[PDB]
Every structure is written in structure tokens, then in C-alpha cells.
Design a protein around this motif. Structure first.
Motif, mmCIF file in Angstrom:
data_model
loop_
_atom_site.group_PDB
_atom_site.id
_atom_site.type_symbol
_atom_site.label_atom_id
_atom_site.label_comp_id
_atom_site.label_asym_id
_atom_site.label_seq_id
_atom_site.Cartn_x
_atom_site.Cartn_y
_atom_site.Cartn_z
ATOM 1 N N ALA A 10 0.833 -1.194 0.000
ATOM 2 C CA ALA A 10 0.000 0.000 0.000
ATOM 3 C C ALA A 10 0.870 1.247 0.000
ATOM 4 C CB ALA A 10 -0.938 0.023 1.216
ATOM 5 N N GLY A 11 0.467 2.236 -0.798
ATOM 6 C CA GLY A 11 1.213 3.475 -0.859
ATOM 7 C C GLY A 11 0.729 4.419 -1.936
ATOM 8 N N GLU A 26 16.145 -8.268 -6.410
ATOM 9 C CA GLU A 26 16.098 -7.661 -5.087
ATOM 10 C C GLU A 26 14.897 -6.745 -4.902
ATOM 11 O OE1 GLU A 26 18.572 -7.990 -2.224
ATOM 12 O OE2 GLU A 26 18.373 -9.813 -3.429
ATOM 13 N N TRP A 27 14.451 -6.065 -5.958
ATOM 14 C CA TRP A 27 13.497 -4.971 -5.814
ATOM 15 C C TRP A 27 12.308 -5.142 -6.745
ATOM 16 C CZ3 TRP A 27 14.921 -2.845 -1.601
ATOM 17 C CH2 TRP A 27 16.277 -2.633 -1.310
ATOM 18 N N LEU A 28 11.194 -4.529 -6.348
ATOM 19 C CA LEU A 28 10.035 -4.296 -7.200
ATOM 20 C C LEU A 28 9.858 -2.794 -7.371
ATOM 21 C CD1 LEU A 28 7.573 -5.988 -8.510
ATOM 22 C CD2 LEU A 28 6.239 -5.101 -6.561
ATOM 23 N N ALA A 29 9.715 -2.341 -8.613
ATOM 24 C CA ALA A 29 9.402 -0.945 -8.913
ATOM 25 C C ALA A 29 7.964 -0.828 -9.384
ATOM 26 C CB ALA A 29 10.322 -0.374 -9.991
ATOM 27 N N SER A 30 7.273 0.206 -8.921
ATOM 28 C CA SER A 30 5.907 0.431 -9.363
ATOM 29 C C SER A 30 5.750 1.867 -9.822
ATOM 30 C CB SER A 30 4.923 0.128 -8.253
ATOM 31 O OG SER A 30 5.188 0.952 -7.137
ATOM 32 N N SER A 31 4.960 2.052 -10.883
ATOM 33 C CA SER A 31 4.567 3.354 -11.394
ATOM 34 C C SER A 31 3.082 3.582 -11.137
ATOM 35 C CB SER A 31 4.858 3.461 -12.902
ATOM 36 O OG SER A 31 4.274 2.370 -13.608
ATOM 37 N N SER A 32 2.676 4.845 -11.106
ATOM 38 C CA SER A 32 1.282 5.101 -10.792
ATOM 39 C C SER A 32 0.792 6.359 -11.480
ATOM 40 C CB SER A 32 1.058 5.222 -9.281
ATOM 41 O OG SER A 32 -0.221 5.758 -8.987
ATOM 42 N N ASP A 44 9.816 -9.366 0.520
ATOM 43 C CA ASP A 44 8.964 -9.087 1.672
ATOM 44 C C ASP A 44 7.971 -7.954 1.443
ATOM 45 O OD1 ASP A 44 10.744 -6.971 1.600
ATOM 46 O OD2 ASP A 44 11.775 -7.509 3.450
ATOM 47 N N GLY A 45 8.050 -7.250 0.317
ATOM 48 C CA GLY A 45 7.128 -6.164 0.067
ATOM 49 C C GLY A 45 7.364 -4.908 0.875
ATOM 50 N N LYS A 46 8.489 -4.793 1.576
ATOM 51 C CA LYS A 46 8.696 -3.646 2.451
ATOM 52 C C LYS A 46 9.019 -2.417 1.620
ATOM 53 N N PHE A 47 8.247 -1.346 1.832
ATOM 54 C CA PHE A 47 8.470 -0.067 1.163
ATOM 55 C C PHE A 47 9.900 0.413 1.360
ATOM 56 C CE2 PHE A 47 8.716 4.571 1.509
ATOM 57 C CZ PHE A 47 8.180 4.975 0.293
ATOM 58 N N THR A 288 -3.459 -1.037 -4.698
ATOM 59 C CA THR A 288 -2.398 -1.789 -4.042
ATOM 60 C C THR A 288 -1.728 -2.760 -5.010
ATOM 61 O OG1 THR A 288 -3.723 -3.698 -3.286
ATOM 62 C CG2 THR A 288 -3.684 -1.722 -1.828
ATOM 63 N N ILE A 289 -0.515 -3.155 -4.645
ATOM 64 C CA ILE A 289 0.237 -4.212 -5.310
ATOM 65 C C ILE A 289 0.177 -5.447 -4.421
ATOM 66 C CG2 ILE A 289 2.509 -4.824 -6.235
ATOM 67 C CD1 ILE A 289 2.960 -1.638 -6.025
ATOM 68 N N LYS A 290 0.069 -6.633 -5.018
ATOM 69 C CA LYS A 290 0.079 -7.861 -4.236
ATOM 70 C C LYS A 290 1.219 -8.745 -4.697
ATOM 71 C CE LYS A 290 -4.841 -7.672 -3.187
ATOM 72 N NZ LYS A 290 -4.756 -7.457 -1.718
#
Ligand SMILES: COc1cc(Cn2nnc3c2CCc2c-3cc(Cn3ccnc3C)cc2C2CC2)ccc1C#N
Length: 296
Positions: A10-11, A26-32, A44-47, A288-290
Motif C-alpha cells: 500500500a502506498g 532484489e526490488w520491485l518498482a511500481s509506477s502510478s 517481503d514487500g517492504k516499502f 495496491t500491489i500484491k
């Protein structure tokens, strides 16, 4: 497969437009549509951080091969190359005359390809930020652009109904319902293409023949990312307008799982490069991203 929900991320304050795993996993990047890029821990999904600077919403993001850079495509008609560590905008790619919808690095990550509502495909030099070529690629907004495995080829799609293959070095076209997404397969020999008649098809482009058709999901209005999952069983993975993530057996064309949880159109899915992990993202009733994980 037995993908099970592990984390909800969530963010974002508006629709999430694209999620992409870093190549080092290592990372997930999201655009919005909220004009922001956000980085999350892939496992782990940690922001981790928010990356800001675009003046209007972002439709797409993509990683360089060494996982150090990002490129984003924005409604402000620019792309921006970001240094992920510092969060700084290294370059702003100007030249499109309308929304930039999709983007990608080539495997060497010395070039960037972009597709825009101005109906062109543009090829950009990462180092100088210069536009090297502008391709009059389609007669309608460009829904996707992707390099093949050595960057010699670009595949583009459009709402004009066409899927075209381009020679990167010369810009010239090698080969030709709205086509709403395309991408090369991991071995480089196939092209997965989505069309707005609720259909996905696997194309051998060397032979120009359709090998497999995948149905079952709802896709009539939005451009939806689809993926080849290869870390375990060989799947086709895609979002859907019925708020589910669909997973097909690549070979048999059977639906083997439907991931339930999102509360809006699943517009983006991505597959982790080494673990049986799926990320999914939804439109503005969800935001949200899951992260989903499977034993195989
Ligand atoms: C590409 O041309 C057209 C577009 C549309 C509207 N429309 N249709 N789909 C998406 C959108 C806009 C919204 C969106 C979409 C799709 C994605 C996923 N996404 C982003 C980049 N690549 C992909 C597959 C994300 C979003 C953002 C809210 C977050 C209508 C007509 C044409 C033509 N002629």
C-alpha cells in the motif's frame, strides 16, 4: 501451481500502472497515475523509497539490466531516466508530442524504446539522452514496445490492430481487433500478443504463425501486461478485467489458477526472475500491489 497471497503493498494514491521486478531480483518498482515511482523489497514487500519528479501520471517503468537505473513514461510527454540509488533524475527524454505510454531498456541498456499516444516509437540514447530514431510505427496509440534478447529487434503493438517488428539499428520494419500488449518470449523466438477480444496468442514470428491461443479471461477495454513465467512450471500470466490474475499452462493452454483478491482491474502482472513469485497491481478502486508465492 499454488500461488498464494503473501503481501499487499500500500502506498499509491491513484491507479497503479505498472510493476516490474529488478533483474537482480532484489526490488520491485511500481509506477502510478499519482505521478510517483515507488520501490519495494521484492521478497517481503517492504516499502523502500518514493521517486518523484514527473508532473503528470506515469504509465510504465522499466529497469536497466544492472538494476541500477529506471526509465519511466509519463503523461507529461517525457520519459525520465532515474538513478535508483540516489533517486535523482539523470535525464529527461523530450520529443514525444503526446502521452508516453510504454518503455523498455534493451539488454545492453545502452538504448531505450518508447511508445506514445503520438503514434510513434522512439529510440533513445541512454548516455546522452538524445533521441536517435523516431519511427512512424502505427496509425493509433502505441500499446507496447519491447526489445528481443540481443536488442537487434523491437516489437510494437497498437490499437490500429497491428503488431510490427523493427530493426533497431536502421529503424526499418521487418515484419507485420486492437492489439493491446506484446512482448518477446524468454528464448527470443516467440511473441506473446494480447488483443481486446479477450484473447492472448503465442506467435512464432520467424514463421509468422500462431502456435497457441489462451482464453478465459476478460480483456476488452484496457492494455494489460502479460508474462512468461519460467522459474517453475511454464506459465502464461496476465491480469484481467474481472479483478483476477490468470495463469495458463503454456503448453496445454489450460487455465491452472486464478488469483483472487484485487478489488479492481488487474492492470499489471510481473514474474520474479528466479523465485516462483508473482506481483500484481490494480486500478483506482484498489491501488495496491500484491505479492503471490508458489511452491512450484
Ligand atoms: C494505448 O492506447 C489507448 C489507451 C486507452 C486507455 N487505456 N487502455 N489501457 C490503459 C489505458 C489508460 C490507463 C492505463 C492503461 C493501461 C495500463 C497498463 N499499462 C501501462 C503501460 N502499458 C500497459 C499495458 C495502465 C493504465 C493507468 C491507469 C494506471 C484508450 C485508447 C487507446 C488508443 N488508441
Amino acid at each position: 501451481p499454488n500461488y498464494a497471497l503473501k503481501f499487499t503493498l500500500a502506498g499509491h494514491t491513484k491507479a497503479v500502472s505498472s510493476v516490474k521486478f529488478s533483474p537482480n531480483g532484489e526490488w520491485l518498482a511500481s509506477s502510478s497515475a499519482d505521478k510517483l515511482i515507488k520501490i519495494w523489497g521484492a521478497y517481503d514487500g517492504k516499502f523502500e523509497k518514493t521517486i518523484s519528479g514527473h508532473k503528470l501520471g506515469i504509465s510504465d517503468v522499466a529497469w536497466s539490466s544492472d538494476s541500477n537505473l529506471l526509465v519511466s513514461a509519463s503523461d507529461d510527454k517525457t520519459l525520465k531516466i532515474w538513478d535508483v540509488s540516489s533517486g535523482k533524475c539523470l535525464k529527461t527524454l523530450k520529443g514525444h508530442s503526446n502521452y508516453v505510454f510504454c518503455c523498455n531498456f534493451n539488454p545492453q541498456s545502452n538504448l531505450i524504446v518508447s511508445g506514445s499516444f503520438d503514434e510513434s516509437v522512439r529510440i533513445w540514447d541512454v548516455k546522452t539522452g538524445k533521441c536517435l530514431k523516431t519511427l512512424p510505427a502505427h496509425s493509433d496509440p502505441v500499446s507496447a514496445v519491447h526489445f528481443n534478447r540481443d536488442g537487434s529487434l523491437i516489437v510494437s503493438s497498437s490499437y490500429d490492430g497491428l503488431c510490427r517488428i523493427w530493426d533497431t539499428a536502421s529503424g526499418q520494419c521487418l515484419k507485420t481487433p486492437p492489439v493491446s500488449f506484446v512482448k518477446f518470449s524468454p528464448n527470443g523466438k516467440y511473441i506473446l500478443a494480447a488483443t481486446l477480444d479477450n484473447t492472448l496468442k503465442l506467435w512464432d514470428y520467424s514463421k509468422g504463425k500462431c502456435l497457441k491461443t489462451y482464453t478465459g479471461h476478460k480483456n476488452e477495454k484496457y492494455c494489460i501486461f502479460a508474462n512468461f513465467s519460467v522459474t517453475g512450471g511454464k506459465w502464461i500470466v496476465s491480469g484481467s478485467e474481472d479483478n483476477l490474475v490468470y495463469i495458463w499452462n503454456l503448453q496445454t493452454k489450460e487455465i491452472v489458477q486464478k488469483l483472487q483478491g484485487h478489488t479492481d482491474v488487474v492492470i499489471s502482472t510481473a514474474c520474479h526472475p528466479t523465485e516462483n513469485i508473482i506481483a500484481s497491481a490494480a486500478l483506482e478502486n484498489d491501488k495496491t500491489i500484491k505479492l503471490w508465492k508458489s511452491d512450484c
